[PDB]
Amino acid sequence: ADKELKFLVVDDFSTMRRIVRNLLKELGFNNVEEAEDGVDALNKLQAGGYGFVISDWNMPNMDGLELLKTIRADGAMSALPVLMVTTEAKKENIIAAAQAGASGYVVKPFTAATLEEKLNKIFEKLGM
Ligand code: BEF
Ligand SMILES: [Cl-]
Ligand SMILES: [Mn+2]
Ligand SMILES: [Mn+2]
């Protein structure tokens, strides 16, 4: 995929954001911003330029399922790739996110290999 693709990495905790940012760097993606919750995310996203979202689930202000739903419901960004990255591992949570239009779903904790496989699975699916 184009190494200029702009990423938004959303999570209410630094540690996770820093892990993902660094991993993206390792893969050749340096165009990366962070947000701390769904509201913060939608703000940056509305400032334009984003090609990919990676999002936590449990966050104050707006959780990741609500964020995903909002993104899918906005006509300007309804096809933005959204990859969930969360501790929520119950099948009902996976179903709910999938049905809400998640592009992919990784369960924390994850390996570097897992994140790369899943990002690539999404690239291939969307012909990126
Ligand atoms: F807080 Be997340 F959903 F891991
Ligand atoms: Cl999968
Ligand atoms: Mn913190
Ligand atoms: Mn969280």
Swiss-Prot record:
Gene3D superfamilies: 3.40.50.2300. The modification 4-aspartylphosphate is found at D56. Changing Y105W: Impairs chemotaxis. Interacts (phosphorylated CheY) with CheZ (via C-terminus). InterPro entries: CheY-like_superfamily, Sig_transdc_resp-reg_receiver, ST_Response_Regulator. PROSITE patterns: RESPONSE_REGULATORY. The modification N6-acetyllysine is found at K91, K108. Its cofactor is Mg(2+). GO terms for cellular component: bacterial-type flagellum; bacterial-type flagellum basal body, C ring; bacterial-type flagellum rotor complex; cytoplasm; cytosol. Residues 6-123 form the Response regulatory domain. GO terms for biological process: aerotaxis; bacterial-type flagellum-dependent swimming motility; chemotaxis; internal peptidyl-lysine acetylation; phosphorelay signal transduction system; regulation of bacterial-type flagellum-dependent cell motility; regulation of chemotaxis; signal transduction. The keyword Acetylation applies. Involved in the transmission of sensory signals from the chemoreceptors to the flagellar motors. In its active (phosphorylated or acetylated) form, CheY exhibits enhanced binding to a switch component, FliM, at the flagellar motor which induces a change from counterclockwise to clockwise flagellar rotation. Overexpression of CheY in association with MotA and MotB improves motility of a ycgR disruption, suggesting there is an interaction (direct or indirect) between the c-di-GMP-binding flagellar brake protein and the flagellar stator. Binds 1 Mg(2+) ion per subunit. GO terms for molecular function: acetyltransferase activity; magnesium ion binding; phosphorelay response regulator activity. It is found in: Cytoplasm. Pfam families: Response_reg. This is Chemotaxis protein CheY. The gene is cheY. SUPFAM superfamilies: CheY-like (SSF52172).
